[PDB]
Design a protein around this ligand. Sequence first.
Ligand SMILES: *CCC(=O)Nc1cc(Nc2nccc(-c3cn(C)c4ccccc34)n2)c(OC)cc1N(C)CCN(C)C
Length: 262
Amino acid sequence: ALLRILKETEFKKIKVLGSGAFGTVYKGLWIPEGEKVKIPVAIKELREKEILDEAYVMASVDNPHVCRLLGICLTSTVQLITQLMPFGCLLDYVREHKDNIGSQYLLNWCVQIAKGMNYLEDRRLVHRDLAARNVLVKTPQHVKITDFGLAKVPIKWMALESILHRIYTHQSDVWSYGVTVWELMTFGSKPYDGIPASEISSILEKGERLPQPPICTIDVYMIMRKCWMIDADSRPKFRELIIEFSKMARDPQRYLVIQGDE
Ligand SMILES: *CCC(=O)Nc1cc(Nc2nccc(-c3cn(C)c4ccccc34)n2)c(OC)cc1N(C)CCN(C)C
């Protein structure tokens, strides 16, 4: 019902925003026939009615912090159309604006991402790929999780049970959220940098986690370490994360120590 079936005519690709294994994501423009408007969109052209039932689930996602699937073009390839996020991804945003981001901005992004995920959990959906590269910036104070439904490997964002047993729950998403928060607090550092992906399980089983980012007080880093608990049920719930980070965002200077914030 809310899945607009497009014809090649109403949309045209411009630049390539990203690519690899699943297909290419392009910057584009959507000028539907019946209308007289040009809407900037992002087009994920996948490789060759197989995944059309997943697209109807993606089209039904109705939350301000989750990207909704606008339309689809079913030809020899599947082409997925969505609103273009003009500021790009949050990972590139925190790297580019590294020296101008205050504690209120980071804590609010934490609330927004937790909210979008808690919406997916309420809808009985699992993301399977939450990362700062997959959080997009609509405006600097409005972020949305993208790539929902593309999952049907990002080892350094995977929970232990996902690497070992291929288990994907809402609790494995919480682990990936903990890593996404680490990416925001370190201004886009790569998790377990240098460290090969084949030994991440060894490191996790050993007891090793991502280090405390300098700007985090103990209170913020404790939320992150709870997301990375071996026991999935001991991790915080997405609705507790909204509560923890919303309270922190009320007095942001107590929880994050930013040079050039107060
Ligand atoms: C983290 C890289 C990234 O996403 N960068 C960009 C994103 C833009 N917008 C946008 N809007 C909606 C959806 C997507 C999107 C979705 N998926 C799964 C993507 C994968 C790769 C790339 C984009 C994806 N993207 C955007 O629009 C203005 C620009 C960028 N980048 C590519 C700008 C240049 N960058 C190298 C700094």
